[PDB]
Amino acid sequence: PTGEVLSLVGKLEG
Amino acid sequence: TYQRWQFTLPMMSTLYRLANQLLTDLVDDNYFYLFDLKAFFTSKALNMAIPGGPKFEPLVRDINLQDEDWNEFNDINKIIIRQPIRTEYKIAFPYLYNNLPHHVHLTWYHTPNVVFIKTEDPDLPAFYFDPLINPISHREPLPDDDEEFELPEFVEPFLKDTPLYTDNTANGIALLWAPRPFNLRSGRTRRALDIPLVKNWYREHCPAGQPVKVRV
Amino acid sequence: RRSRHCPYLDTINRSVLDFDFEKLCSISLSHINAYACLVCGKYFQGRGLKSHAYIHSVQFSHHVFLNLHTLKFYCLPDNYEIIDSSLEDITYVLKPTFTKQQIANLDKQAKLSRAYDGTTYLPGIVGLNNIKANDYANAVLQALSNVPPLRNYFLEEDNYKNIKRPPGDIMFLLVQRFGELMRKLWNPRNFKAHVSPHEMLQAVVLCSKKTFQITKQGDGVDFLSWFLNALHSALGGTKKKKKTIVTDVFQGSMRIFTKKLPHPDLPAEEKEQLLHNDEYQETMVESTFMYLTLDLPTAPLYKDEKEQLIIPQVPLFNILAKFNGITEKEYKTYKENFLKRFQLTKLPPYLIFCIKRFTKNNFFVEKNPTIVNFPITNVDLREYLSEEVQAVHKNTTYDLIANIVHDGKPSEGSYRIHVLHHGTGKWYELQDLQVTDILPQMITLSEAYIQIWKRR
Amino acid sequence: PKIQQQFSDLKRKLAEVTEEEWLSIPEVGD
Amino acid sequence: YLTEHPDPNNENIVGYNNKKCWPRDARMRLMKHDVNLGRAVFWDIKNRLPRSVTTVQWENSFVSVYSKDNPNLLFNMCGFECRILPKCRTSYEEFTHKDGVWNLQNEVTKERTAQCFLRVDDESMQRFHNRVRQILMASGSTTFTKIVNKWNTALIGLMTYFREAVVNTQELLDLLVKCENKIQTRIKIGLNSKMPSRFPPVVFYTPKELGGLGMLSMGHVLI
Amino acid sequence: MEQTLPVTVYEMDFLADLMDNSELIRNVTLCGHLHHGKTCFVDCLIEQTHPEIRKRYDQDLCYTDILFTEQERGVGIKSTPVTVVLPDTKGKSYLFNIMDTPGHVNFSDEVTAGLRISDGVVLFIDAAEGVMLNTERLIKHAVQERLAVTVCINKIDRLILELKLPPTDAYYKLRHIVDEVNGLISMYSTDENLILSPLLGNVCFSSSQYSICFTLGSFAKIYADTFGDINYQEFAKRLWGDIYFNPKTRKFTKKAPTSSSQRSFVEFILEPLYKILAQVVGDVDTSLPRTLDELGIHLTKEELKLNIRPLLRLVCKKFFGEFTGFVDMCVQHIPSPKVGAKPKIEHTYTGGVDSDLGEAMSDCDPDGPLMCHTTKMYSTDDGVQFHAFGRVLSGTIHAGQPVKVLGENYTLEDEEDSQICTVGRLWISVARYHIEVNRVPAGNWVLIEGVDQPIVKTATITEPRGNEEAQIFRPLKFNTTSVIKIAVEPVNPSELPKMLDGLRKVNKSYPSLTTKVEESGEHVILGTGELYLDCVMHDLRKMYSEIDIKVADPVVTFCETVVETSSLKCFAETPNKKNKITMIAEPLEKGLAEDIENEVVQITWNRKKLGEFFQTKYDWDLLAARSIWAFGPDATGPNILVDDTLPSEVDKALLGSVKDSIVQGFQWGTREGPLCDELIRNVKFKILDAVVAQEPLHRGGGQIIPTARRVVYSAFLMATPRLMEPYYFVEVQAPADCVSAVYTVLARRRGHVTQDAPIPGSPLYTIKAFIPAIDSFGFETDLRTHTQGQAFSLSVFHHWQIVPGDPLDKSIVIRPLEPQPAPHLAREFMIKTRRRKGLSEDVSISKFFDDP
Ligand SMILES: Nc1nc2c(ncn2[C@@H]2O[C@H](COP(=O)(O)OP(=O)(O)OP(=O)(O)O)[C@@H](O)[C@H]2O)c(=O)[nH]1
Ligand SMILES: [Mg+2]
Ligand SMILES: [Zn+2]
Hints:
It is classed as splicing. The entry lists the keywords exon-defined spliceosome, late pre-B state, RNA splicing. The entry is titled "Cryo-EM structure of human exon-defined spliceosome in the late pre-B state". Chain A: U5 small nuclear ribonucleoprotein 200 kDa helicase. The structure is cut from a larger assembly and holds 1 copy of chain A (14 residues), 2 copies of chain B, 1 copy of chain C (456 residues), 1 copy of chain D (30 residues) and 1 copy of chain F (852 residues). Chain A is 0% helix and 0% strand. Chain A has 14 residues and is mostly loops. Chain C is of the alpha+beta class and 456 residues long. By secondary structure, chain D is mainly α. In chain D, 53% of the residues lie in helices and 0% in strands. In chain D, 0% of the residues are buried. The chains are: A little secondary structure (14), B mainly alpha (216), C alpha+beta (456), D mainly alpha (30), F alpha+beta (852). Chains B and F meet through helix 3, helix 4 and helix 5 of B and helix 3, helix 6, helix 7, helix 9 and strand 9 of F. Zinc ion (ZN) is lined by residues 37, 39-40, 42, 56, 60, 62 of chain C.
């Protein structure tokens, strides 16, 4: 688990 | 200097027999339909991949089909769809299926099938009705025998004495279709580096039922 | 027999007839036997059972057609000729024809004509539609019109229709379509106050081989030079006929006195010794010119106290100083420098100036913003001629009649043209499709790019 | 072309000026 | 319009500005009639204004036509990108609640008649990207706290103006995370010349008053 | 003249001298199947007559197939004319105008164009494949076009080097090929006077790769040269055909001695050929020198070092020499054409042989009226100017002489499709070089410059101020129908005129191409097949117009028909509210459409014979049989117009007054069609009633024609309408193994395998099947790639069949981009083609009534 910030795309379902 | 050579047909036949294992025994280029360097050139220039073929970076900046804005021409309510137009069709007919065909290469059309009957059994006569040949289902203003036509004494067929076929006739006939350099009888000398043995192996289709790593 | 009594004549409407484009069947693309329907204004193939015109007639109930090539009317499907004098204007607009008295009286027309729609105009002063990037061609063609001799020559198709041309010659499209365009422009009974140069520009692009397109605008001077040379060559039949109309009207003769400078980086002894070499001596290379190239002085690069306006300015005669037997221009080709003198020998009746604005510096193309301060109504070129030629030349006072001006940056440029309307003396500024009235005193305040002067 | 090639003409003309003017040139201090 | 400016080649489609950001079947469909109508309307409007006072250029303008062939009505306003789709026209589908979709319903009968889809203007996205670039360049010798304050203000402004459009725009989320990573990498490079591996996020996201940088986040960061 | 020409055996002056004597001119067309040796045979003749032009050793020079596309693809695309002077075996020279045609089945239009101006046909048959699809089709076409025919069996070396068959079985194979050809000729021709048999000289044996060509006469001549005492004519008469040689008596018999003697053919012709080939190929270094010494053939050491194939070609060339058997064939069995002129005029000329001009042309003399007929148009390499290639049936063409050009629509009454032009230069076209001449007398082929403008496909060139009773030669009748359809648009709309010029030029170049503009402004091109359209698109995009062009996806053109009689008798009235028509529609009987199309019946017939046929063959009453009015869109169309009007209800004279107008309306309605605006096929339209107004200005013209079309449309729509799909006939030539793969690929595309048989004498199989034209796209590449190139297919239009679904069904729902199942293919095809054409969304059976 790197400290990088990941795109929200696809992670807004809930 | 070991620069040029000229062999004899029996030598060439024996060398061909020995090399047999490295050769595919193909008598035509019909095998390479849409699988030769020209088809690959066309596929590259159009940035498309033959199912078994390589895959390069777009030669030009690809036209995104999400870019054109639905003219009257490319309206999808007018198009009758029966079979998906595969990439093979566009390589086969580059000017009928592609818009903007640039640096595209036309591919040799069919070549007549080479119906060659490989001789399995040496003992057989050279000219022999092989079982592979389909049988000919048998069935003329000739003159009357009473006519006085007589041939002179000297006359007989041109080469009566000479035998029809000899020991090394089938071998020569096979060499007529042997792949290069086994079709030659003279030439120059190359370098062991310059002679690749498996280029014709990977130029062919991949054998069926092979793992993904070897396919790639 | 029923001719002169066709009951469908009222169906025609001249608001849709547009005869400014290619004449081909709209269904089959054939040029053979083209008929235009006078109820909708579309072209079909001509006449006869099962033909496109016949089927269109029976399909749409449009029962009046005109043979685009014969100028005869017909009523379909029962095809019989139609004869009615009220239809003559349609034929005239389709194919204008100017009679000798008309061309003689063309310039003395002080009364505005009126198009079919409620628009007044004057023949010749008529706008040219603007396809994407066409203004340069519009301006050049407008300037070429208004030249009485060339215009009068091209207003009669019989003049140039019979000359020979090799088999695969596409360079005659230029001459014939130019005649068509001239007749259309000077038509005194148009259906509209504007014309479309579409066909002429298509011929231009075809003959120039994608040079001078219509989606990109080129240099006005380059287009003018190429057009004049092409017209001269095309009118020279199967040879270089030494005297065409273009040569008769525009071409003059100059005498160039070139002197090869010895060298800049040599000692004085060798430099002056080379004078006797004869290689660095004045020569006489007399040649011909379609148009004079005037070179503006370089911009001052610094503002001054006088004429506080940052805009510089020059008199006309200062830039006309060149082309007298005194001044010396400095040509510089690689490894060689030349001192060029000039001396006009034969002056043409219609003289063209092509003032050089755009120059390529080391990095980009720069437009010289200097304005030439010139008189319009009188200029005497007598002095710029040799005394050996002044005796031959009787009249030498010129008047400006056309002036093409360029505005904007070199890239996003635009062209407009000031034209003097003969008959009257009014000056009109034509931009691609707009016709303004410009006062005589405001012409000299623009960046005159090209000019055409008349000898009187 | 090259820069000195461009400036050759002005250099040649500069040749003309006289020594009297050469040592009389002002300085930007003004 | 066509009498004034005849078009024999149907050239009226070449220069027609279109909204590339939308998908192909949501953009305008350049049919002959609609293209001619749009050009004619623009010509009519342009004719009214004298060109000495002001001009109305075609390149910087956009005219969208809704008709029997085009089912969407598009426009850009105040940095938003709005596309209105009628319910009767090419919808045929039930709709759940998405963030960027406004349910425009008739005001008298209270019936859902249309849906407005929102996106962020490409110009606004580029403006935000350029603001981040300015922050990074001008950082120079400035402090990490000031850099993060600039980033926080920019992000707050963007996210409070384009509230739903940010969620609806997929490109904007990727841009946001890329810019946030750029800021974090700038801080790390300032920390030491050699980039680390798996840098802890506590340092960035701890509140300012508690010793950290108090960085605001609009991405998927798993602690 | 005096132009520069390549070195030649003969001389241009002698060629011109021969050109005047029409008894030594042979107009021949080389035709056959794909890749059967025609081009290499022509190459070798050119080499014989031009000692400088030579075929490369390992690469075959063609000297035809000149185009870049031809060279790249390997398939001939355009017919090429070659005029040469070839010697006879007797030593007498003749002038041969040989039109070499492409072999591919898509390009049969070139073959028909060549036939129109040829007098004889030479059919090339491969010795291993045998008789194939295009050979059958071309035999049919030639016998129907009334041309003398002869056969050359090529590639006879495959029997020796590929199948290595015994001499007797090779003889059996050749005999079987001859029997097949004779069977086909008898089937397609009633007359039995055209029997092909080598004894008669109608068949020759050739191997173009190895430069061999001979008849029985020529190979007896070689024996005569070697031993001087034989009459090679009698020897040839005895060689072939179950004639065994008795060497003890030195005499031939119909009865076999020893029960092991071979026929004289095998003994004398075949066996020594086997020996020569085998000795060259297998024992080149042991006994070949002795065998060549025996043959008398002496070859230099440089030569005998060649590889096997070049050595074979050289040795066979040295042994046989020139192709005199071919010349003997053609000289004996093809008209003069002084003799062949009369059938040509009888068949082609529209004015008939009986006409005075018919006689003037059937005489075929140089000093008469000018009646050139141009069928081809060849474009200069630059692609700007075209030259008309055609034959001179009478008179003499002079360079610079003004002429009058008549197009295909010209009639002696409608004198507006004519135009006066001026001919600039004349050429005698050898394949890769053109001889410029000053004149051309009757009976020859010529390229004419300056007459291209007023013509599109075919034209007739006569003289002005004369031949006022001049009529046009019939337009070419094509062996097939162009069905495949594509749409074309430019990429930059600013360059439309360039595309239009390209479209016109391709229309001129390709005889059977049809280019048109639909109602929605879409430019459509019709072609026979995918390779055809690919070549057309290449030429359009590269040769003629130099722009970028977008092409729509291929689609076929459908037809419309009915399957049952109209529910009610329909009717309409003129806008004038007079002139009422009332019609019914029904389906025709099986085969009647085929009869009408194939001209088994002609409306030009006397009504006596017409009613005789209708009553005797298709079980009609003579009352109706003598009530026929029209035959669909053309004079030969698959829809019939009868007038059941009894004499008691309508004045027959009054009805005949508007007969022509009603016929025009009927033909227009059938040509267009209401369902999708496409041809109507196989329908009988019966005029049940016709109330005709009294005054001519109240009837006729713009009153009846629209009403007639509307009544036709209403009756057709009332009758249960259906769409008809074109169907292609596919023939696949595969190995003995891949037949199952062929079955699978065909079954994937609604195919139906009619037959599958072995090729006698060869290890291969022929699979004949039926495919839908619309599914045929990509079928050949699918087959070849799936089978690894071992299976090859050629497809051609066969017949129209009803699409499975019901078109006028509004219950069905169609998604834009899904392959639909069969039960509503009709509805999909109707709606989408309506959209393409730009018509309304749907058509209702009441649209064209007068009630709604
Ligand atoms: N074995 C053998 N092959 C031949 C012979 N003659 C021609 N071929 C081959 O057959 C192929 C067909 O070539 P062509 O005869 O030139 O083509 P064509 O006859 O004009 O047929 P089209 O391409 O349709 O015009 C060539 O690739 C030749 O190599 C022959 O006599 N024997
Ligand atoms: Mg060929
Ligand atoms: Zn109309």
